[PDB]
């Protein structure tokens, strides 16, 4: 069940061959060898316990996998099917040795999709979208300067009227804010700022009233405040935010959103480093970034890419991928998504191959 060995059957442990031990992908995303399918004599898949279509009889074998070793609904739909199958096969050849590890993981996910079933087709679409999105975020990093990245981030933060004082200093300030507001007190801007300023243990570049005001502004943008006015504006900490864990979570998330609006793709380890100074929060930041991902964020990313691509001119003519990327972003990731039609499946996979090929071409010929 390890994604790394896809050329071997999970059950029989032996590598796949073209005659007897034959790769057969099921609807659940697992590929088991034919001999084992015959040998099972049980309805479902031992790994997930999902029911099946019918036997080995109606299930085709993965050719896409076998390359690395050595007519139901009518003519139109099966033309679509054959084309799609061909696409997956063409992608699989990148798995022989070029692509990055996280990319090829999603490729492997794509290969294990059985295209003669609804489940497998849905999985194929999701894997397609994931591959597209990952390609976009890998094209953005090429046009993104890693050296001055932090500088740009903090610039974006300061431009919104917010401020980050550093990993320790910010913890201090936030715990002072929390101290004042944890019981439900309603303080105005100046009162909260004055309360926090005086309690700051002196370090050298001491935050002034304005800086702390900016940190408070950051907490206000994150919607931590119940804000009221009797005709001075009073701010209260919502019941769920009166813990340091929660409040800090919202704080971090807000800064991440600032990074997104400005178009900075930043890894969770880098976030843990910037915000906390250490690596302890990597999983925390991971959860934060994942929680922040809307299905509309793919399209957003495509647009951002187009912006950066408008800056440099276009040495690689990547705009040719624009109609392909827009199609990949237009498919519902939600479980509420209807199963794809045959034309949708074909167009999706075609889009995927065009895009991935484009990515490789860019990396090799333009840098």
Residues contributing to the site for Zn ion (CB under 5 A):
9, 11-12, 28, 30, 33, 36, 45, 47-48
The distance of closest approach from Cβ of residue 1 to Zn ion in the complex, given in angstroms and rounded to an integer, is 9
Question: Least separation, in Å, of the C-beta of 9 and Zn ion?
Answer: 4
Tokens of 284: 């925390």
Measured N-to-C along each axis, helices 297-311 and 118-140 cross at an angle, to the nearest 10 degrees, of: 30
CB of 64 to Zn ion, least distance (A): 18
Residue number, nearest CB to Zn ion: 12
CB of 21 to Zn ion, least distance (A): 6
* Backbone torsions φ then ψ of 24, nearest 5 degrees: -130, 115
Torsion region of 229: left, alpha or beta (phi above 0 gives left; psi -120 to 50 gives alpha): beta
**Nearest CA among 175, 235, 222, 236 for reference residue 200:** 175
Q: Which is nearer to Zn ion, 28 or 113 (CB)?
A: 28
Tell me if 9 is assigned to a ligand binding site.
Answer: yes
Q: Which residue lies nearer to Zn ion by CB, 30 or 284?
A: 30
Find out whether 30 is annotated in a ligand binding site.
yes
Q: Binding residue per annotation — 162?
A: no
Which DSSP state fits 333? -
Q: Is position 28 annotated in a ligand binding site?
A: yes
| Closest among 172, 68, 79 to 111, alpha carbons compared | 68
Q: Which is nearer to Zn ion, 47 or 154 (CB)?
A: 47
- Based on CB atoms, which residue is closest to Zn ion, 12 or 246? 12
Q: Is 87 annotated as a binding residue?
A: no
The answer to whether 12 is annotated as binding is yes
The residues, any chain, with a CB within 8 Å of residue 58's CB and separated by 6 or more, are 116
CB of 24 to Zn ion, least distance (A): 10
What is the distance between the alpha carbons of residues 34 and 308, in angstroms, rounded to a whole number? 49
Tokens 């480093």 found at: 273
**120/213 with CB nearer Zn ion:** 120
**CB 48 to Zn ion: min, Å:** 4
Q: Which residue number, 59 or 197, has a Cβ lying nearer to Zn ion?
A: 59
**Contact partners, residue 26, CB within 8 Å, separation at least 6:** 32, 45, 50, 52, 59, 114, 117, 120
Positions at the binding site: 9, 12, 28, 30, 33, 45, 48
Positions at the binding site for Zn(2+): 9, 12, 28, 30, 33, 45, 48
């Amino acid at each position: 069940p390890q994604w790394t060995d896809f050329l071997s059957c999970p059950i029989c442990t032996q590598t796949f061959d073209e005659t007897i031990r034959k790769p057969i992908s099921l609807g659940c995303g697992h590929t088991v060898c034919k001999m084992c399918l015959n040998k099972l004599h049980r309805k479902a898949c031992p790994f997930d316990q999902t029911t099946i279509n019918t036997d080995i009889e109606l299930l085709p074998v993965n050719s896409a996998l076998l390359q690395l070793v050595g007519l139901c609904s009518g003519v139109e739909d099966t033309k679509h099917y054959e084309e799609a199958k061909k696409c997956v096969e063409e992608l699989a050849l990148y798995l022989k040795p070029v692509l990055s590890r996280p990319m090829q993981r999603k490729l492997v996910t794509l290969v294990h999709c059985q295209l003669v079933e609804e489940e497998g087709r849905i999985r194929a679409m999701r894997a397609a979208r994931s591959l597209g999105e990952r390609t976009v975020t890998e094209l953005i990093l090429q046009h993104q300067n890693p050296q001055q990245l932090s500088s740009n981030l903090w610039a974006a933060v300061r431009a919104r009227g917010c401020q980050f004082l550093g990993p320790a200093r910010q913890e201090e300030a936030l715990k002072l804010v929390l101290l004042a507001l944890e019981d439900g007190s309603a303080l105005s801007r100046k009162v909260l700022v004055l309360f926090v300023v005086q309690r700051l243990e002196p370090r050298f570049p001491q935050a002034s009233k304005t800086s702390i005001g900016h940190v408070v502004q950051l907490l206000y943008r994150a919607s931590c405040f119940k804000v009221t006015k009797r005709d001075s504006s009073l701010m209260q900490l919502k019941e769920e935010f009166r813990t340091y864990e929660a409040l800090r979570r919202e704080h971090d998330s807000q800064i991440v959103q600032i990074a997104m609006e400005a178009g900075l793709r930043i890894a969770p380890d880098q976030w843990s480093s910037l915000l906390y100074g250490d690596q302890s929060h990597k999983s925390h930041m991971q959860s934060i970034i994942d929680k922040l991902q809307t299905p509309a964020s793919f399209a957003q990313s495509v647009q951002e890419l187009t912006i950066a691509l408008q800056r440099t001119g276009d040495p690689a003519n990547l705009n040719r991928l624009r109609p392909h990327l827009e199609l990949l972003a237009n498919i519902d990731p939600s479980p509420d998504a209807p199963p794809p039609t045959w034309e949708q499946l074909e167009n999706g996979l075609v889009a995927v191959r065009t895009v991935v090929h484009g990515l490789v071409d860019y990396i090799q010929n333009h840098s």
